[PDB]
């Protein structure tokens with residue numbers, strides 16, 4: 001049950017961090033730490049959409065744009 | 070050419086479909102360029118003030 | 119009831135002049151029909167399509 | 175084309191939202207109506 | 216009872232405002248044009264037992 | 272307005288980069304639709320004509336600019352010589368005689384318009400399916 005524990009760990013972390021960004025839609029540390037956690041997986045086609053919907057609530061900050069760039 | 074009439078809605082009906090959905094707000098209108106004044110930084114001491 | 123009892127008629131029941139209470143409890147429903155009509159319409163809305171928690 | 179809950183999506187015939195005062199009183203000529211505003215000093 | 220019906224009759228005669236409604240409707244003629252409502256001539260007790268049956 | 276302005280064709284190779292469906296004119300993603308005010312009676316008459324015998328005339332304005340033909344099942348139009356459903360035909364063929372009882376006096380014998388007509392191995396497979 002290695003795949004079960006792997007998907008369980010990833011699903012718990014994704015659910016906790018999606019509840020975190022659902023609770024606070026202002027501070028931008030949560031989206032960038034979640035998206036760099038997916039960047040640690042090194043093969044993603046979904047983290048670009050995360051940075052794309054993370055700049056809709058705040059496009060005036062430099063940190064999110066420079067980190068995604 | 071075809072014929073288009075309307076079915077009569079009887080006035081003995083509650084609202085049929087559950088209007089209780091809640092989604093997060095989507096992407097808004099796309100951001101215009103921001104075009105402020107040239108941003109300045111004061112000193113090392115007035116920031117300490 | 120105190121106009122049946124005038125004369126040698128009797129104290130017991132038999133008071134069957136009913137139109138006066140009938141008119142005022144028609145006057146009740148005459149004004150309450152749109153009120154609890156709207157209330158039961160709101161009840162059918164709250165039951166069948168659900169409530170609105172943070173809408174209005 | 176898909177408005178809010180106030181338009182069509184609700185049968186909540188709510189209290190305080192009724193056709194009360196369905197006519198607008200207009201300021202007539204003896205008060206400070208804009209026809210007498212456009213010329214007074 | 217005399218003086219309290221005098222009170223209620225004076226309170227009804229004092230607030231006798233004119234019926235300033237602009238349009239008029241009936242709500243029975245609008246039901247009858249619909250295919251789901253039909254007109255028939257029945258007995259009284261059938262109508263009463265029918266509406267209490269439907270209310271239950 | 273001038274007929275020459277709308278009659279002037281478009282200079283080009285028809286642009287075959289698109290397919291036959293997408294290069295076709297439309298306003299809805301499925302066909303150019305527009306309301307009109309056609310009479311009801313002849314509409315429903317030719318509708319019932321095509322529903323019964325399977326032939327009707329062809330409604331359009333600018334397909335070929337000359338059109339007076341029949342559509343659907345072709346041979347049954349000239350077989351019946353173009354009759355309608357509201358017209359008494361030239362013959363009364365294959366007619367079907369019912370029985371009537373319209374005295375309204377007898378019990379369990381009155382059969383007027385509610386009358387039944389004078390005329391009035393698969394189970395093993397259906398058991399094996401279910």
Ligand SMILES: O=P(O)(O)O[C@H]1[C@H](OP(=O)(O)O)[C@H](OP(=O)(O)O)[C@H](OP(=O)(O)O)[C@@H](OP(=O)(O)O)[C@H]1OP(=O)(O)O
Pocket residue numbers: 119129130131133
């Ligand atoms: O007790 P009283 O003040 O003297 O009035 C009563 C009383 O009427 P009210 O209480 O409404 O004033 C009775 O009604 P109940 O409330 O006791 O049911 C009524 O009898 P009805 O129900 O037939 O109307 C009749 O009393 P009675 O049974 O003797 O007819 C009547 O007046 P009297 O007691 O003076 O007759």
